[PDB]
Design a protein around this ligand. Structure first.
Ligand SMILES: Cc1ccc(SCCNc2ccc(S(=O)(=O)NC(=O)c3ccc(-c4ccc(F)cc4)cc3)cc2[N+](=O)[O-])c(C)c1
Length: 200
């Protein structure tokens, strides 16, 4: 049961957004090839959910979470049905009742990533990213790193932290100039030009 507390204490130690950074890499790797928005659908909720439970003792801690915990799963039942993706997760999408959770929890990492996306032309930044709806930044500023995982899982957290400081600056100028529109493209491409070559 402690497994639940470990996250409860960690959630407060880090936060709501950061906490997702970890769960994300875990959820993403857990079910590869399940679309980005999807993983965020539940992830974004699970993370923010931490706020729903943070005041009552261990006694009312779990119970307070069970509320959404039971709701989410119930939603995935029909939700997943609409999205016929995956296998091990799909085949075990509709059981004979009484063995829905067990079949899920019992299931471990699969990493059965057969397909891939080599579309470099796609994916853009655009200026709207820092003009049309600021709140959007919440989701926008997150998938960028996720893409790197899908393209090549297994990253260096120690090194990632470093870039986190440099990224804070990039975004700053990214939207704080007269001709930011061109910068987003020019500057946005430059970064890709250096990465395309190599990283180390
Ligand atoms: C249609 C579809 C398919 C996949 C996905 S991505 C997420 C895959 N689903 C998933 C993954 C792991 C676990 S798990 O490993 O058994 N549970 C956890 O990892 C877990 C982590 C943290 C907490 C936690 C609880 C309380 C708290 F305060 C903090 C953390 C609880 C459970 C459970 C599910 N699930 O039920 O769908 C999508 C999106 C759609």
């Amino acid at each position: 049961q402690n497994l639940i507390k470990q996250n409860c204490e960690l959630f407060e130690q880090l936060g709501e957004y950061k906490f997702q950074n970890a769960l994300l890499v875990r959820y993403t790797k857990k079910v590869p090839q399940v679309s980005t928005p999807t993983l965020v659908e539940v992830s974004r909720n699970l993370g923010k959910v931490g706020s729903k439970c943070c005041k009552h003792p261990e006694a009312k801690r779990m119970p307070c979470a069970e509320d959404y915990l039971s709701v989410v799963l119930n939603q995935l039942c029909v939700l997943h049905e609409k999205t016929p993706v995956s296998d091990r997760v799909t085949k075990c999408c509709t059981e004979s009742l009484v063995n829905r959770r067990p079949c899920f929890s019992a299931l471990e990492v699969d990493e059965t990533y057969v397909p891939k996306e080599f579309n470099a032309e796609t994916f853009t930044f655009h200026a709207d990213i820092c003009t049309l709806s600021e709140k959007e930044r919440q989701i926008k500023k997150q998938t960028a790193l996720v893409e790197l995982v899908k393209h090549k899982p297994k990253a260096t957290k120690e090194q990632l932290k470093a870039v986190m400081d440099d990224f804070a600056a990039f975004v700053e100028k990214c939207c704080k100039a007269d001709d930011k529109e061109t910068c987003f493209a020019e500057e946005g491409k430059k970064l890709v030009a250096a990465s395309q070559a190599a990283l180390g």
